[PDB]
């Protein structure tokens, strides 16, 4: 699992 | 899974 | 899965 | 966002 | 974001 | 953020 905010 | 918020 | 919001 | 395996 | 794996 | 392998 990747989970990115940006 | 990938999520990402850009 | 791949979920993307740009 | 929800994702589920069962 | 919610990810359950079961 | 929550992710859970059960
Ligand atoms: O957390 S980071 O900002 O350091 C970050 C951000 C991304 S990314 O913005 O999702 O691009 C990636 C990444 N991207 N993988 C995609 C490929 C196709 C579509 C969508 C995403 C990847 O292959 C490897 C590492 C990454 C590290
Ligand atoms: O999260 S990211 O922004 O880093 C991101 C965004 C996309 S994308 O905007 O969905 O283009 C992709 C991607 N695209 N795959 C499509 C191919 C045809 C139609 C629609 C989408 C891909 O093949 C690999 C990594 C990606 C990483
Ligand atoms: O991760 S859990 O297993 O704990 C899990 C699993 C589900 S579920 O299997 O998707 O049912 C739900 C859920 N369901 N929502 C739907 C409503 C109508 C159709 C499809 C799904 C819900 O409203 C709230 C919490 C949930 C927690
Ligand atoms: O890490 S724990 O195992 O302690 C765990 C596991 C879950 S759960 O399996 O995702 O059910 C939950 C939870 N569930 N939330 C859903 C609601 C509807 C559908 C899917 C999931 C919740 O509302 C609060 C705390 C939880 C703690
Ligand atoms: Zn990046
Ligand atoms: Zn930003
Ligand atoms: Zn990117
Ligand atoms: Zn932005
Ligand atoms: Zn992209
Ligand atoms: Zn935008
Ligand atoms: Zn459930
Ligand atoms: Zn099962
Ligand atoms: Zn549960
Ligand atoms: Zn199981
Ligand atoms: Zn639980
Ligand atoms: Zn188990």
Do not use: D, L, M, P
């Amino acid at each position: 699992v990747q989970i990115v905010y940006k």
